[PDB]
């Protein structure tokens, strides 16, 4: 109903700056509060740096839910979104 099926998704597939920032902050928080890390850490002890690297590898388990003006939403995966 408010959801829209993945076959007919119409929103842009690039990841907007706001989505980037929100995902980075959310993940870095989670990372910084005992959340598992989906990629390797070598020298970047900074949780924000860990989040940046993990996004660069497209290994972040978060789904964006964008709200259409009407009220309907669609579900994009951080995996599928084309990160520039």
């Amino acid at each position: 109903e408010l959801a829209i099926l993945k076959e007919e998704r119409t929103t842009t597939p690039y990841l907007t700056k706001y989505e980037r920032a929100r995902i980075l902050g959310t993940r870095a928080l989670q990372i910084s509060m005992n959340a598992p890390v989906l990629v390797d850490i070598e020298g970047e002890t900074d949780p924000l740096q860990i989040a940046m690297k993990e996004l660069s590898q497209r290994k972040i388990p978060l789904v964006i839910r964008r709200y259409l003006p009407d009220g309907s939403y669609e579900d994009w995966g951080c995996d599928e979104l084309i990160v520039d």
Binding site: T11, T12, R66, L68, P69
Partner: protein, 48 residues
């Protein structure tokens, strides 16, 4: 000197009014420019 002193406050007031007027307009995903209620002012921001 007098001219500068007068002009500054008036410019501040006008800027305040404008900012208050448009403060709610944002760009949704559909590419249309709507205020809070959902009115559509531009269907494609700036026409591009």
């Amino acid at each position: 000197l007098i001219d500068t002193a007068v002009k500054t406050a008036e410019t501040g007031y006008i800027q305040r009014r404008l900012v208050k007027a448009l403060e709610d307009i944002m760009v949704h995903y559909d590419g249309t420019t709507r205020n809070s209620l959902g009115d559509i002012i531009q269907f494609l921001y700036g026409e591009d």
